[PDB]
Low affinity immunoglobulin epsilon Fc receptor
Amino acid sequence: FVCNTCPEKWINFQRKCYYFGKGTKQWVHARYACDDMEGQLVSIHSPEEQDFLTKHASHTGSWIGLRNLDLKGEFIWVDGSHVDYSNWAPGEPTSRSQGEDCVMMRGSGRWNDAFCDRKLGAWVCDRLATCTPPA
């Protein structure tokens, strides 16, 4: 059993599928775009997953599945997972909004807090990879 099979217009990495979305859309507005295309906004859990994303990343920044609910201070991924791997930029995560503050990836791959209503050029979708029959 291996997971290399990817859907149309999606790139494989380990056991995940990544869609490098393009188009002027705000955070929650790109979050729902992932859903319709049978996935979710990218959950970054390893330095390897990050460097792959840094490789295919956009020059003008990309949206990622990280959102704040300060009422805790901390951040949560869209898949319900907490923050393991952290690629914060200098000063980050200092909420550039109090509470609800979404996270975006730069060209450098470095995360920074951004206003929930920022109209960004790109976003990164992700789903698990479709499995392989036995050898």
User: Anything to note?
Assistant: The chain is about 15% helix and 30% strand. Residues 10-129 form a domain with the Mannose-Binding Protein A; Chain A fold (CATH 3.10.100.10). The beta strands are 11-13, 16-25, 40-41, 62-68, 75-77, 102-105, 111-114, 120-128.
